Design a protein around this nucleic acid. Structure first.
Lengths: 134, 169, 182
RNA sequence: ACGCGCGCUACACUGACGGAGCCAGGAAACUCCGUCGUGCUG
């Protein structure tokens, strides 16, 4: 349900079991790794109220790599708290939420940044080419 | 954006002489708390032009820079940029010609910064040990800035900047 | 066509070659056959790499060239050339054939008769003629003729409607040597 | 013969090199696994 700086991650919500697959995989993998956490850290981040739950998982895809990674990010907890009451918490879903966003920036809504704009100049944007007429 | 954790997670909540701590994990006066320094150590590392691997860099530099005589790693990193900042250098004069340069603070965030990209630099400039461990130079040099926090041994200009802004004052 | 005639062809060819062991090529032109229909002949009558996806790729795991790589290789001739030199035969998933000739075909086809064999040789393509490698300078004239016969047999069988009658002209030639008509 | 300017890619170990992972408005930079040994070497 959440897109990230030219990327976009979709949310799956309806109670089930373990193995929450991202794309069509398993937030065990998610191999653009290094910072492979911050993904498993939404679920881990559940460290504030829940321990893992027993629910669902969906696929992302847009822009490029770390973009996507950051997208699947919100994607998750931006879908634990899912309305609710069949998804979030049948009452006071600020349970997670305010907790899963008292140290967040992914589920903590998205960033007002997004690529565009250049210039009749050099590279463009602001970096206008280097000229030194004599 | 966009690092990690664990790997030791030795969070020394003390070690912070002078001011500092009132900005040991900050930026503001101009960020906020750009993750407890080690988000800038890892960042001041992007001197080719792109983070990640930079991220690795940091991490490796860490496990390494603590494995080797552990001081809680993070507190070596704090205690790195800790006893390793400038402290009232000079800055031009204008009162002459043909200036002279007088000295003083050192706006904290300075002291942290001006030593951050600095220790960063001394690292970058391998050439000793011109090995292949970027994170080593990055560590040792930062380690020679923890153990080096016992003179000299990598910073140096650390002093210079200060051990100079005394005479021409 | 007849054994004696081919023997002469082969014998003459060897003598003419003049100026490494060359190889003998047999070329034949066909007439009165429409190339448009499935008149074309592709057959294996006369180190391995596998190009394909899962299953086929799994079995191969031989060098495996994945479906994703095909375009990449077309783009980089440097690597493709190396790959072609390294392996004697290529097998490819049949569905993949359009893509491989589009991208790979220029390197693989030509002469280094490297074009892959489809899986779920004498390859006419749309053109009227065929060129096949029959043997070496090392082998006897008798053997070269026997090999040529095996090639001829395929054609005889295919247009069973006309057979060998289709062969307009036949020629033999060494690598370096000039072609001589049967 | 030579001058002045806009550049392109390089001096390399955050690297080059091969196999591999993906995905943008079989993109590449990039991540991993392995080879080279800071020597005008690769």
């Amino acid at each position: 349900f959440g897109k990230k700086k030219s990327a976009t991650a979709v949310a799956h919500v309806k109670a089930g079991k373990g193995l929450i697959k991202v794309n069509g995989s398993p937030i065990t993998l998610v191999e653009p790794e290094i910072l492979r956490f911050k993904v498993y850290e939404p679920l881990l981040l559940v460290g504030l109220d829940k321990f893992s739950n027993i629910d669902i998982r969906v696929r992302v895809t847009g822009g490029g790599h770390v973009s996507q990674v950051y997208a699947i990010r919100q994607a998750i907890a931006k879908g634990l708290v899912a309305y609710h009451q069949k998804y979030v918490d049948e009452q006071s879903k600020n349970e997670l939420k305010k907790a899963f966003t008292s140290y967040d920036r992914t589920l903590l809504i998205a960033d007002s940044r997004r690529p565009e704009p250049k210039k009749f100049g050099g590279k463009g944007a602001r970096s206008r080419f280097q000229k030194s007429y004599r | 954006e966009i690092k990690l954790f664990n790997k030791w997670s030795f969070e020394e909540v003390e070690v912070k002489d002078a001011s500092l701590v009132d900005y040991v994990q900050v930026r503001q006066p101009q960020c906020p708390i750009i993750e407890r320094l080690t988000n800038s150590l890892m960042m001041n590392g992007r001197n080719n032009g792109k983070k990640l691997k930079a991220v690795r860099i940091i991490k490796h530099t860490l496990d390494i820079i603590n494995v080797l005589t552990d001081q809680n790693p993070i507190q070596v990193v704090v205690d790195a940029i800790t006893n390793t900042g400038p402290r009232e250098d000079t800055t031009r004069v204008g009162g002459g010609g043909a200036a002279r340069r007088q000295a003083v603070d050192v706006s904290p965030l300075r002291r942290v910064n001006q030593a951050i990209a600095l220790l960063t630099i001394g690292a970058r400039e391998a050439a000793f040990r011109n090995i292949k461990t970027i994170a080593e130079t990055l560590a040792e040099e930062l380690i020679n800035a923890a153990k080096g926090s016992s003179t000299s041994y990598a910073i140096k200009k650390k002093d210079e900047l200060e051990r100079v802004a005394k005479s021409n004052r | 066509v007849d054994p004696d005639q081919t023997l002469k062809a082969c014998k003459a060819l060897l003598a003419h070659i003049k100026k490494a062991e060359t190889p003998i090529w047999l070329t034949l032109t066909t007439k009165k056959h429409i190339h448009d229909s499935h008149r074309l002949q592709p057959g294996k009558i006369i180190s391995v790499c596998l190009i394909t996806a899962d299953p086929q790729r799994f079995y191969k795991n031989g060098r495996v060239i994945d479906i994703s790589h095909l375009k990449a290789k077309f783009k980089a001739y440097e690597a493709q050339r190396k790959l072609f030199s390294e392996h004697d035969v290529f097998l490819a998933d049949t569905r993949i054939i359009n893509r491989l000739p589009k991208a790979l075909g220029k390197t693989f086809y030509k002469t280094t008769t490297k074009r892959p064999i489809p899986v779920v040789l004498v390859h006419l393509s749309p053109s009227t003629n065929t060129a096949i490698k029959v043997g070496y300078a090392n082998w006897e004239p008798e053997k070269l003729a026997a090999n040529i016969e095996t090639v001829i047999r395929e054609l005889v069988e295919r247009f069973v409607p006309q057979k060998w009658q289709n062969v307009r002209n036949f020629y033999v030639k060494g690598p370096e040597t000039a072609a001589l008509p049967i």
